[model samples]
Target chain A: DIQLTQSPSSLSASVGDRVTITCRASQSIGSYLNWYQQKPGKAPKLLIYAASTLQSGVPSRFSGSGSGTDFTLTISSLQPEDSATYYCQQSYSTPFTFGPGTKVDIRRTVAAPSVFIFPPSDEQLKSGTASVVCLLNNFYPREAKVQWKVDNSQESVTEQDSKDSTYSLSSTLTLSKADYEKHKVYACEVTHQGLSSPVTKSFNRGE
Target chain B: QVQLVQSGAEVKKPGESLKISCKVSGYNFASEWIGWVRQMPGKGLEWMGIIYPGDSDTKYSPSFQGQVIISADKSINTAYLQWSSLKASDTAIYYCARQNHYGAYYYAMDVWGQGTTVTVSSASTKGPSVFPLAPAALGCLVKDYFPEPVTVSWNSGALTSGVHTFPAVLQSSGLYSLSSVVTVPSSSLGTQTYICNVNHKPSNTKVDKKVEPK
Candidate 1:
């Protein structure tokens, strides 16, 4: 039942630069961690296990350290071929788990998203319902955190491909006429790699 | 260059004992650790365990520690995975591979055995086990079905979304295994009749599993 996570879900490192990825466990798991490297269309290859013990064939530059709930996997110097996803897994208990994965690329840039919130139109609300939408455009590298909130509640988010290889996202929160009359404020919050913090936007039902 | 040549396929009955072997060449038999990977009938690969041939230092993944044993005979440069009593779930193809020591930490497994198959069967008349686990999800697991091509469908079609039908996998028995699942809301789990339909091609077999509401 231990959950695992990796920091910097992804990164871009130039060749020869040292790159390190940290993996954490929800609870103490001792030195039961393992690290793996995987490229598209290939099986995940083991690098280190029992936390820091290197697999016989793994290169010396690839080392692992730490125990219990904290562990780290390091690449002494990045190489172009290292542009793959790395995952950390725990073998301490049943139903073992793997971190979501930290992707390393040779060269790339994070694209900041342009955000918008569409209010329920006059054409929309009077008929007994309306759908409030939060839209994000042209973000890249990976997904963004998006949510639609009202006073105390929330949205279902959707993702799609953009024409220029970026990502497009939307989170919708529908308000029925009965519910609409009960509230006057609606909001959307978006978190992305390109921003210092989450962006919050709101709409006034009266407007 | 290292090479790993493993034992052939094995067929067993439940409650039986079994041991499979992996022989190595092209490298020092005791120079590296040999690990095992398991792929169930239609599931993903899982690391089972690893053994240091030179020292007999063995490590088992959480799931395999008490379920199987890993050992090595350095004299013959061979590694083994032994089961004192096999169960139906033990059916899988196990691969033995050598962990490489690349100076730059690049390649992991430079050599691997052709892989050995272990089929732990209960009876010829037996079908794979079945039970509907939580979250209102039902997994239609039809094992040892032949012809490879199979289709899965839900009764009312939609109480919700998602029908994950995994590709059929061929087993050592030459029969194929397939799985499909549908998840609905927890509130809906008890109120409605849940039905799953399957169409086996060519031979044209109509099979269905229905969960009738009480």
Candidate 2:
């Protein structure tokens, strides 16, 4: 069993400002680290876990990094609703433990979109290297449907399977870019049943 | 806004009995179900069971089947994970979580309450048992005035009580164990005391009985 000690119990920040929180384990709990956001009366949604793998429906603004006994939860830009509490937990061992959590709010500050990169400048290419990177900027649960399409090729994007119930969606994709770009257009499509499908973002540098 | 606070820690002797409670606040008490999870000193999570406070609908993990009771109260929005008896090895931390049953009823815990720890202590540390496998051997059948689902027979030649091995762990719920020596002379299988002891963990204790040989 693990004893989770979440810190910065509560915090306040303004739009566009980076907000962060840390969860310390009583002992080292390897890659099992996971982050979650909880609002009043609603179920907690998973943001990041196992260090960097993003949950299915999460947004890009919400990113996770760090491993071993130490971890950091960073929200690139603060939003009003993001004011809720954010926590970190270890899913690596039994009886998962979580950090107390940090809360973010909108203070008097400027809000600007973060410049996130795709293709990561250069990736280690090998014969079997087939990958795509999906960046989701807005994420909500059940209401949000995010999927990946490779180069116009209609590959399937499995929504939520064997995934813990804590996550709404995730941002970041590292997959077979070759296949995804083969059709000259790799895209991340978001569709909320009732909501209109957001404009698709495509990646095809050669064209 | 919902919050769950659990009962205090519990300490018990090897043969005693104990249980704990998890009380909730802020939500409409009867709307959701509460589930209990177990984490031994340094082990992973184990789903114990789920209890609906409004209707008291309960479900148990196959591993915890017939082992403990799960129940809740709607008026109070509180749930409980209990054990009828206890053993020294039952010591561990227990947590209360909200079962996510929005539409389709599958098993997943979306929200979790902080956890509480439970510890069981004993005087002599009875021990971790070691048993051998057998097709079906309930305490080596006290072949005499035995009644109710109890029977013993020989494998090869005759109705002899010589070389046979039984699982060290009670082969079944109400059965016992016959030691390594077998203890019965083929003929004078007369006046002898054969005993079987069964142990149920995580709350239940042990039961033993001695029978007069036939």
Largest lDDT belongs to which candidate? Answer: 1
Cα DockQ of the candidate 2 complex: 0.01
The most accurate candidate by DockQ is 1
Q: Each candidate: fraction of true contacts kept?
A: 0.01, 0.01
lDDT of 2 by residue, B1-214 (tens): 6678887555566677676778888777687767787766534445576776777877666667677788776656678877777866677778787754322232235567766657665532222221211111112212111011122233222424332222222322222222221324435444333444433232234334343321
Per-candidate DockQ versus the true complex?
A: 0.03, 0.01
Q: Per-residue lDDT for A123 in model 1?
A: 44
Off by over 4 Å in 1: A1-22, A26-34, A38-43, A47-86, A89-207, B8-11, B39-47, B55-66, B99-114, B123-214
Evaluated against the true structure, the overall lDDT of model 2 is 0.50
Candidate lDDT (C-alpha), each: 0.66, 0.50
What CAPRI class is candidate 2? incorrect
Interface RMSD of 2: 25.4
Residue B95 lDDT in model 2? Answer: 77
Candidate 1 local lDDT, B63-167, one digit each (tens): 788889999999988899999999888887787878654432322443556777676665332233222211234445455564434556778455335444455
